[PDB]
Amino acid sequence: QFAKPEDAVKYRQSAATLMASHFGRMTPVVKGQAPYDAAQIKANVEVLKTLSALPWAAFGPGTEGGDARPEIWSDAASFKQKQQAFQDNIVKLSAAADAGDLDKLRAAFGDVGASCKACHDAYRKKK
Amino acid sequence: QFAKPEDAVKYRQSAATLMASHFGRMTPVVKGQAPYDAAQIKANVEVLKTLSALPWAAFGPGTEGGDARPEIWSDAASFKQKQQAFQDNIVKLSAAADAGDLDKLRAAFGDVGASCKACHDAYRKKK
Ligand code: HEC
């Protein structure tokens, strides 16, 4: 869907921006600094689930740019493993949210964050 | 969910970027220049539906910035009417996609595009 590689870069960066907001806005809730409303979090995690499927199709070969490290394309299987494992972690977060289980939510939230970081550490250029 | 107004601006611009990609990527399909696969379009419109609900909460009072025109906040009811009417147009597009009806899809797609433009004309600053 991208006329030029720059369009893929802009897309995946915007998807990431939205993921960071929908993930990060739950930090106060999982810390107990903001109240836990199960329906609110269920709905937010459903947005995050949709968003968290979106970046990967925007790393389609030849879309080097931005802060993607080159290793994404040359090790396609390993990058796919990491995005699939991340989306798996999002499924666990969805299950916790859908159950209204705050303890499971906290644990799942931590695992998701670790998965974001693990991918960035391997595949995102430093600043 | 925004620490500063700049964060709301970045969010709503990124949401718009994704909406433009998910809407605009169907142009060749509605023109017949690309093939029509009903399942593909159904899934894409479901992404667009999720995305098209997201910008509005990121124009929460005092978030002047970016290319929002000031009129968004001082005429809250009129801006709300336009976003709700736009989301209505997205419901029509969803119905067409879910029905697998290409003629209804074309018509709905045009109405959605007109709704995007009508809001920009009133509420987005020129370049
Ligand atoms: C690999 C499987 C990733 C996972 C899992 C997550 N992210 Fe990511 N992210 C990844 C890459 C390769 C890039 C660089 C994209 C580019 O072309 O520049 C990013 C980028 C981000 C950013 C920065 C976006 C920008 O402003 O330019 C953010 C804020 C970000 N990613 C957030 C994020 C979160 C919150 C994640 C888990 C919920 C997450 N990413 C997972 C690769 C991967």
Ligand code: HEC
């Ligand atoms: C009002 C109810 C709007 C509707 C409906 C749509 N858009 Fe919009 N859009 C709106 C505003 C006020 C702004 C400016 C945001 C800011 O703070 O700068 C925008 C912006 C865009 C952009 C530019 C994003 C950027 O790169 O900075 C795009 C590409 C965009 N909008 C696309 C878009 C599409 C495709 C829409 C219908 C499917 C649509 N917008 C509707 C307000 C409104």
